[PDB]
Each structure stands twice: as structure tokens, then as C-alpha cells.
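Work Package 3 committed the consortium to producing structural models of liganded targets before the mid-term review. Because experimental data for this complex are still outstanding, the team generated a predictive model from sequence and the ligand definition alone, so that downstream docking and mutagenesis planning could proceed in parallel. The input record is reproduced below exactly as it was submitted to the modelling pipeline, together with the SMILES string for magnesium ion.
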Amino acid sequence: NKPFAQQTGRFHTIELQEEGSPDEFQELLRLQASTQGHVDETTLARLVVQKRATKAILKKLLETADRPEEQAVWRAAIERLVIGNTAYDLKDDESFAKLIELAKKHPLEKVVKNVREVQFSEKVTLSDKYAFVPASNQGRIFLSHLRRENIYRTPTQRPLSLKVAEEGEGVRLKEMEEKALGDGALGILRPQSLGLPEDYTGVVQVRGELADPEGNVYAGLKGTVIVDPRAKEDFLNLNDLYRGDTVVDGKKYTKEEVDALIREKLKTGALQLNLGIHRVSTVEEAEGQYSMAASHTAYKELDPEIYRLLEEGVELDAEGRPIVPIVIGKEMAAKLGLKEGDIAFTFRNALLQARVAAIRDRLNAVVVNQEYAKSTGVDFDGDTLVVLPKGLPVDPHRLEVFQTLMAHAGLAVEPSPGELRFKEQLEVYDKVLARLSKSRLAAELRNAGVEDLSNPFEVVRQLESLGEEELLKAFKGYLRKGFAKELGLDLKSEEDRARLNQYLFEGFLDYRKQFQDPRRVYKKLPLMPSAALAASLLQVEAHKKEYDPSDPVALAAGQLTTSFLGLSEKLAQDLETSIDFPKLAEAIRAYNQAYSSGNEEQVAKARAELVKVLNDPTVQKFSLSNLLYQIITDRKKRDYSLRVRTESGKTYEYRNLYAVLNRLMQNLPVEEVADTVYDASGQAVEERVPLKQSATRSLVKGLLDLASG
Ligand SMILES: [Mg+2]
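The resulting structure, written out as C-alpha cells with the ligand in place, is given here.
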């Protein structure tokens, strides 16, 4: 309903961009359009962030001359302020008295357009939309500025207060593997513990903090918990909460250093959990219906059948379209007309075929294995998986297709075949089949309608389909004598005999209910050679770097540079209408075939043809656009950069992605707007960044007082 900075009282909040006012950053962005990309985007963002914040902190410092002891927290949001020639160290009762003095005697905006410097406290956390400051300086808050912005800016409804204790009644804090319950998940608790309607069973997205009475908060959690009355204890996984990696009172408390303070506080029964709900997972329509996604890894404990179902692999169909196992609930299965075994389709709000492996009574999530849906990038912190009925009124794309493009855009890299889930079993079955296909029994089967004896899951299915109970006892009995043979088990020993039926049926034949062909079900999905090829033709990667954790402008300034993600998206849409998906799919399917069991000639010619399609400008720009969309989205957390290795052997690095976005658009060479260039192995040949910055601050000061005489 309202932001978590206000619903808990930790931070006071002020707005950075006022009521519908013009976006002054979008207007500076055509200085880059005029100059053809020789000003710095992140420098322009800083000037905007420093003006909006200086105007907002000030507008509060006067409206709070009447709430004076609430003003003192906004005082320590600016240390020193240079206005004209005088300097205001706000820590002084003297300078701050003078600061509020000229405040009233002079008007707004135009006066702000006349400060020179500004330095912010470590207390203030700047973002693209707000500025946060802790309510009480008494306590201390043990998480970095990015995690404050990640956790406390999200709107949640009224927060709860759950006890944290190891023994007795409360929430326990287990120390498991990181992401053990899934990436975006961070705990399992019951519906009745956070006040949900009786025996709710799904997943809910929360924004909790872990505090003590004295106002200190040691960890903040961002992500989802799994709600289910079937688990015993409300428990939170410590290693999935944001903790440490910040500076309190001059010292840097690492992730491990804060973990000890909690273990000490948790032992003393003086540790709570202030948690707020952001969205409870319903099953709602979209045709199609959708709900949140949960990892199968978080049902290991409770309802293990869901886990074991989705852990035993995925299978590629006859055309190469992977069919992923999901687990849905009663409401969704009804509205989408699906029962167990049905094939459907699913996507995150890439499109994959889905195999219903189970249906639950009260579930309202879409439980999937995540390693098999990495092609649709499902992160379990509130991503909604849509499911569609069995009608299949569309062409689902083939594994080689999107895994290759995803690789040509550096979002995946070597050609590796998969891991056959039934490798050892099918070997043993093929040795028996050499003898079975010769036997009279094989003729009995082919006379009853079962002519292809190569698929064990089909012969057993096609037999119990059309009666023939006796021709199934003989088949199940022949494979017993054959496998006991082939594995050296004595069919008489009643424990050795119990090992046959434990390997042949339980471990193999019983899985005919989930999979069609055991020869096409994998445990680790392969990497098609066209994808390994496609990733060596475009040498594009997304380089990771953290925003300056000491300067609060760096994050907010970085988040402003995200306000043109839409132009990155239109470029992708406007580009994919050109690429002939028919020719690309056949060009890929040809190379993967000629690679696997092709002659020495075609592995060369199929390579040279696919290479010329991927060195094509329309294709290269579409994949490069797809990369920029991910980089821009990620820059809302870190100072990510683009890196490209060209035919010169050099590698170029970019942090002016709008200029890059312009150069791709009008089909211009993109190397001039770059920020730094490297010499293959050697590095830092041109450092263009310092020049673009001071010229930006110069061309700014020019454009300003020139429009004002
Ligand atoms: Mg997500």
C-alpha cells in the first residue's frame, strides 16, 4: 500500500522529482544527440541528482522549522554546502543557523541553480525517486545503501512483528546453502504465522527487516517466502538476507562480522522480525492464467514428491523443443483444463512446452525446476509464470534456436552434449533388445500392434493400452531375465531379485508416466554447437562493477541513466521484424546436424554459412540490442558496462549506452562514443572518460548562463 521506509519508521522519505515537473535529465540527453556522443551520460545524471536532492533536502529543512527536533535528522543529510562564496558546514550550530537564515530571505529553484559544491552525509541514501535518512541516529543500520534502496523503497502493506528465537515460539534462522530454496526465496513459514487466510499454501513476496528493541537492524531480506502449513517451524535462511558489507562508525563490518552479532542477539531472545507483505500469490487469468514461481529445491522437506518429480530431468521432443516439468494447483488446472501428464506452455510475464507432473489440492504457485527454465530467466522474487491450455495455437521455439541467439548476445560457452538420465539403463536394454528382436516374442508383439520395439516406454504403454495383459507379462518377464543377466543378479535370491524390480521398474520403467522417449530425456541439458559458435562471433559481454559505496550520488546517478530503457526495447522489437527466423532456424539445425555426425566437408561449410548470417548487421544489432536491454536493467543496481572485442583485437568499454543506442539506430560506427579502450592483453591505451566529464560540466555552465544572459 505504501513504502516500507514509512510503514516501519526506519527512514524518513522525501521526493526527488516533484509533482509532475519536467524531467530535466531527458532534456540534457540531447546534448549527447547533438554532440554525436561526446559528453558523459553519468556526469549529466550527477548534476541532476545533486540539484533535485539539494532542492528537496532544503525544502524540508524549512517546512521542518516548525517540527524542529524532526528537522535535526534532515540537518545531517548535507555536511557542507557551498553557495556563492560562503561555505556552510551544517554540523556547526553557527553555519547551520546562517544556512536557514538566507533560506527564507531568498526564493527557490533559481537560487539553487547557484550553489557550487555539495557533499552528502553517509546517513543519506540517494535513489532515482526518493532520498532516505534514518529516523533515529541512536540505533545503527547494518546494510549498504544499495540494499537500503532495494529493501525499503518497495510498497508493502502493514508490517508484522514476529519473534526470532532458536527454542520455543518464533522464527528460527537456519544457516543453509545460499539460494538453497531457490534464488529469490529466503524462507519457509506457515500461513497462520503471518496472518494469512487459514491453511494458505503458496508463495508470498516480502520485504522484512531483522531488528532489536534498541533500533539497530542487522539484516534486511528481499525476496519471497514459501507459505505452507505442512512444514513445522517458521524458519529464515540467514545466507539469503542482505547483511554487512557497509561502514558503521568508521569500521567496515563484513557479512561474517554481522552474522556473529545476530547469533549473539538471537541467543538472548531479543531479536525480532519486522516483515511486510507486498503481494500474495493468487491464480488469476491473463487466454491464460498465472501465478508466482517457486523452485522445486524448496520442497525437499515438505512434499518431496514435487521435488523428486522435477529433479529427474527434462526431455527434448522429436523436433528439439524441451518439455519442462511443472507442478500447478487445483484452481489453475481447472481453469486451464489440464490433468497430470498433459502438455502445456509456460513463460515469464522465451516460451517453453511444459509437462504437468503433478497437481496439488491447495497450491497456488507454479513450481518448476529452475535449472531447466534458465532459458526464461525465472528468479523467484515475485516472477509470475503464465500457463496456457493444451490447445497449442502457436509455434514453440526449438532449443538450438533461442540458446544460440541468447549466446550470440552474451547472455548464456562450448559444445557439450547432455547427460542422459537413463544412460546406463538404455545400454543394458539395447543388449537385451538385440536378442529380443530376434526372438519369437518380438513377433508376438509386432502381431499385437507393437512393431517398433526400440522405445521401452512406448511398448509398455502401447500394450496396457490395448489389453494384451499376457504379452505384457512376457515382456516384463523377458526384460527381467535379460537385465538380471546383463547386471549379474541371481533371480532366485529374494533380495537380489528385489534389486531387479528396484532398478528396472522403480528406477526406469515406472517413469513412462512422465516421459515419452527415455532416449531423449537428459539430466543436464546440452549446449548446442551453434550456440558455442554464435558466442565466439560476437565478442560482447556485460562487465560487472559496483557503484561507489561511499558516495551516495553514484547509485542515484546510475539509476537516472536507466530512464531510457524503453528506447532499448523498441530497438529490439524494431530489429527482430527484419531477421528471417525460418532461415536462421534451418541454418542452425543444419550446423548442429553436420557437426554431430557430418562429414569433414560439411562441418566446414555449415560453419562458414552460419558465420556470415551472424556477422550480418541486422542480426548483430538485434543481439547487441538484447544485450543492452539487460545491461541497462542491471545498471539499476550496479555500474555495469558493455565490452566488445572487435576485428582489431582490441576491446572497447562503454558507459554511455544512450550514445551507443543512437549509433546503432542511425547505423553509425559505435567506437567513438566509447569510454575506455584496451590493447588485447595490454590495457588503458585511451582513457577518454576524464575529457567527456569536464567538457560536460563546461558545456552545462555554458548552456545555463547563456540562456540567462
Ligand atoms: Mg525477478
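Reviewers should note the following from the model. Residues 423-521 form one domain. These observations will guide the Year 2 experiments.
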